[PDB]
Write an enzyme that holds these catalytic residues in place. Structure first.
Site, PDB file in Angstrom:
ATOM      1  N   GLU A   1      -8.105   0.539   9.830  1.00 31.84           N
ATOM      2  CA  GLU A   1      -8.711   0.517   8.010  1.00 31.84           C
ATOM      3  C   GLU A   1      -8.506  -0.582   7.608  1.00 31.84           C
ATOM      4  O   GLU A   1      -9.833  -1.562   7.382  1.00 31.84           O
ATOM      5  CB  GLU A   1      -7.580   1.365   7.448  1.00 31.84           C
ATOM      6  CG  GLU A   1      -8.651   2.080   5.988  1.00 31.84           C
ATOM      7  CD  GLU A   1      -9.044   0.439   5.474  1.00 31.84           C
ATOM      8  OE1 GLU A   1     -10.466   1.254   4.791  1.00 31.84           O
ATOM      9  OE2 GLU A   1      -8.487   0.352   5.265  1.00 31.84           O
TER      10      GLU A   1
ATOM     11  N   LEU B   1       0.781  -0.984  -0.340  1.00 26.32           N
ATOM     12  CA  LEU B   1      -0.024   0.136  -0.002  1.00 26.32           C
ATOM     13  C   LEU B   1       0.454   1.591   0.734  1.00 26.32           C
ATOM     14  O   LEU B   1       2.071   0.980  -0.073  1.00 26.32           O
ATOM     15  CB  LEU B   1      -1.288  -0.272   1.285  1.00 26.32           C
ATOM     16  CG  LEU B   1      -1.805  -1.375   1.085  1.00 26.32           C
ATOM     17  CD1 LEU B   1      -3.450  -0.849   1.614  1.00 26.32           C
ATOM     18  CD2 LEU B   1      -3.018  -1.409   0.085  1.00 26.32           C
TER      19      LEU B   1
HETATM   20  N1  LIG Z   1      -7.155  -0.385  -1.890  1.00 26.16           N
HETATM   21  C1  LIG Z   1      -6.374  -0.841  -2.043  1.00 26.16           C
HETATM   22  O1  LIG Z   1      -5.854   0.115  -1.439  1.00 26.16           O
HETATM   23  C2  LIG Z   1      -6.041  -2.096  -2.602  1.00 26.16           C
HETATM   24  C3  LIG Z   1      -4.335  -2.015  -3.110  1.00 26.16           C
HETATM   25  N2  LIG Z   1      -4.077  -3.365  -4.321  1.00 26.16           N
HETATM   26  C4  LIG Z   1      -2.551  -2.864  -4.435  1.00 26.16           C
HETATM   27  O2  LIG Z   1      -2.500  -2.730  -5.741  1.00 26.16           O
HETATM   28  C5  LIG Z   1      -1.670  -3.391  -6.030  1.00 26.16           C
HETATM   29  C6  LIG Z   1      -1.821  -5.448  -7.398  1.00 26.16           C
HETATM   30  O3  LIG Z   1      -3.290  -4.444  -8.176  1.00 26.16           O
HETATM   31  P1  LIG Z   1      -2.220  -4.748  -9.851  1.00 26.16           P
HETATM   32  O4  LIG Z   1      -0.997  -4.704 -10.071  1.00 26.16           O
HETATM   33  O5  LIG Z   1      -3.575  -4.206 -10.231  1.00 26.16           O
HETATM   34  O6  LIG Z   1      -2.502  -5.984 -10.013  1.00 26.16           O
HETATM   35  P2  LIG Z   1      -3.800  -6.876  -9.860  1.00 26.16           P
HETATM   36  O7  LIG Z   1      -3.782  -7.920  -8.572  1.00 26.16           O
HETATM   37  O8  LIG Z   1      -4.975  -7.387 -10.860  1.00 26.16           O
HETATM   38  O9  LIG Z   1      -3.436  -8.896 -10.593  1.00 26.16           O
HETATM   39  C7  LIG Z   1      -2.845  -8.222 -11.946  1.00 26.16           C
HETATM   40  C8  LIG Z   1      -2.489  -9.763 -12.438  1.00 26.16           C
HETATM   41  O10 LIG Z   1      -3.846 -10.870 -12.582  1.00 26.16           O
HETATM   42  C9  LIG Z   1      -4.399 -11.215 -13.273  1.00 26.16           C
HETATM   43  N3  LIG Z   1      -5.294 -10.711 -13.927  1.00 26.16           N
HETATM   44  C10 LIG Z   1      -6.298  -9.043 -13.345  1.00 26.16           C
HETATM   45  N4  LIG Z   1      -7.461  -9.620 -13.522  1.00 26.16           N
HETATM   46  C11 LIG Z   1      -7.941 -10.520 -14.132  1.00 26.16           C
HETATM   47  C12 LIG Z   1      -8.837 -10.799 -15.255  1.00 26.16           C
HETATM   48  N5  LIG Z   1     -10.022 -10.062 -15.198  1.00 26.16           N
HETATM   49  N6  LIG Z   1      -9.321 -12.301 -15.873  1.00 26.16           N
HETATM   50  C13 LIG Z   1      -7.886 -13.108 -15.528  1.00 26.16           C
HETATM   51  N7  LIG Z   1      -7.078 -12.115 -15.461  1.00 26.16           N
HETATM   52  C14 LIG Z   1      -6.399 -11.128 -14.295  1.00 26.16           C
HETATM   53  C15 LIG Z   1      -3.463 -11.245 -14.263  1.00 26.16           C
HETATM   54  O11 LIG Z   1      -3.041 -11.910 -14.521  1.00 26.16           O
HETATM   55  P3  LIG Z   1      -1.931 -13.123 -15.336  1.00 26.16           P
HETATM   56  O12 LIG Z   1      -0.984 -12.401 -16.561  1.00 26.16           O
HETATM   57  O13 LIG Z   1      -1.528 -14.822 -14.713  1.00 26.16           O
HETATM   58  O14 LIG Z   1      -3.349 -13.264 -16.613  1.00 26.16           O
HETATM   59  C16 LIG Z   1      -2.193 -10.026 -14.570  1.00 26.16           C
HETATM   60  O15 LIG Z   1      -1.087  -9.545 -14.620  1.00 26.16           O
HETATM   61  C17 LIG Z   1      -0.624  -4.248  -5.167  1.00 26.16           C
HETATM   62  O16 LIG Z   1      -0.052  -2.845  -5.533  1.00 26.16           O
HETATM   63  C18 LIG Z   1      -1.688  -4.537  -4.266  1.00 26.16           C
HETATM   64  O17 LIG Z   1      -0.785  -3.557  -3.096  1.00 26.16           O
HETATM   65  C19 LIG Z   1      -4.783  -4.448  -4.614  1.00 26.16           C
HETATM   66  C20 LIG Z   1      -6.081  -4.294  -3.982  1.00 26.16           C
HETATM   67  C21 LIG Z   1      -6.455  -3.521  -3.488  1.00 26.16           C
END
Ligand SMILES: NC(=O)C1=CN([C@@H]2O[C@H](COP(=O)(O)OP(=O)(O)OC[C@H]3O[C@@H](n4cnc5c(N)ncnc54)[C@H](OP(=O)(O)O)[C@@H]3O)[C@@H](O)[C@H]2O)C=CC1
Ligand SMILES: COc1ccccc1/C(=C/c1coc2nc(N)nc(N)c12)CC(C)C
EC number: 1.5.1.3
Length: 186
Positions: A30, A22
């Site tokens: 939170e 984060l």
């Molecule tokens: N509330 C908050 O402040 C939150 C913070 N976060 C943070 O955000 C970051 C991670 O987020 P982000 O980088 O967006 O990544 P995601 O968690 O969305 O992961 C991306 C990987 O997930 C797979 N993927 C994502 N969407 C799909 C889909 N619809 N179908 C199939 N596969 C999918 C893909 O994998 P593949 O290549 O294997 O197909 C992709 O490369 C971190 O910094 C975490 O700390 C995460 C959630 C909430």
């Protein structure tokens, strides 16, 4: 299956992550809010399901993985099976939601909670139907490398109250934040 929801905490500059963690220092209460909202099921004999992308799953410390008391489903097109500790794997959001209606899950799942990251939030938020967003507004800018999608307030109404969500300003570690619930139905 019950309602579909997204939950997030977001800085003023729309940031949700930096380098896999984060953007802000740990905000214990939170996080307790996130666990309470995502775990609490309105229906006896059911658990809630959390859906997340792969990088989000791996951003949870091993200690806290899977999210306890919830069914954990990970989204990926690269993985061949669920990661160590996860319960389900789906290749798309539509596939995951379809899965929730199979014999395996149909009577086990109450609420569905999308817990990130950015692309999963974006697809959920633009998909027709009834959806809420549980957004914690962290009221400062923090350097980020991942961001929350635009909330279209034509369609997402900010609710004036919601049971179980405090309406006043919170503060931890000198960082003010507040809780919001949005609802669309299209
Ligand atoms: N509330 C908050 O402040 C939150 C913070 N976060 C943070 O955000 C970051 C991670 O987020 P982000 O980088 O967006 O990544 P995601 O968690 O969305 O992961 C991306 C990987 O997930 C797979 N993927 C994502 N969407 C799909 C889909 N619809 N179908 C199939 N596969 C999918 C893909 O994998 P593949 O290549 O294997 O197909 C992709 O490369 C971190 O910094 C975490 O700390 C995460 C959630 C909430
Ligand atoms: C301490 O929180 C984290 C630390 C490291 C990696 C991931 C997370 C999480 C991110 C959040 C996703 O939606 C969230 N919504 C809210 N209101 N708060 C959160 N904190 C998250 C919770 C688990 C997924």
């Amino acid at each position: 299956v019950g309602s579909l929801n997204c939950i997030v905490a977001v800085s003023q500059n729309m940031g949700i992550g930096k380098n896999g963690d984060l953007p802000w220092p740990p905000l214990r209460n939170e996080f307790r809010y996130f666990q309470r909202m995502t775990t609490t099921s309105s229906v006896e004999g059911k658990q809630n399901l959390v859906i997340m992308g792969k990088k989000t799953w791996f951003s949870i410390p091993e200690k806290n993985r899977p999210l306890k008391g919830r069914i954990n489903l990970v989204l990926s097109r690269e993985l061949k099976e669920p990661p160590q500790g996860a319960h389900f794997l789906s290749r798309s959001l539509d596939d995951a939601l379809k899965l929730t209606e199979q014999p395996e899950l149909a009577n086990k799942v109450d609420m569905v909670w999308i817990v990130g990251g950015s692309s999963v939030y974006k697809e959920a938020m633009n998909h027709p139907g009834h959806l809420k967003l549980f957004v914690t507004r962290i009221m400062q800018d923090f350097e980020s490398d991942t961001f929350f999608p635009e909330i279209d307030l034509e369609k997402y109404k900010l609710l004036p109250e919601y049971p179980g969500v405090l309406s006043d300003v919170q503060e931890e570690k000198g960082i003010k934040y507040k809780f919001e619930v949005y609802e669309k139905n299209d």
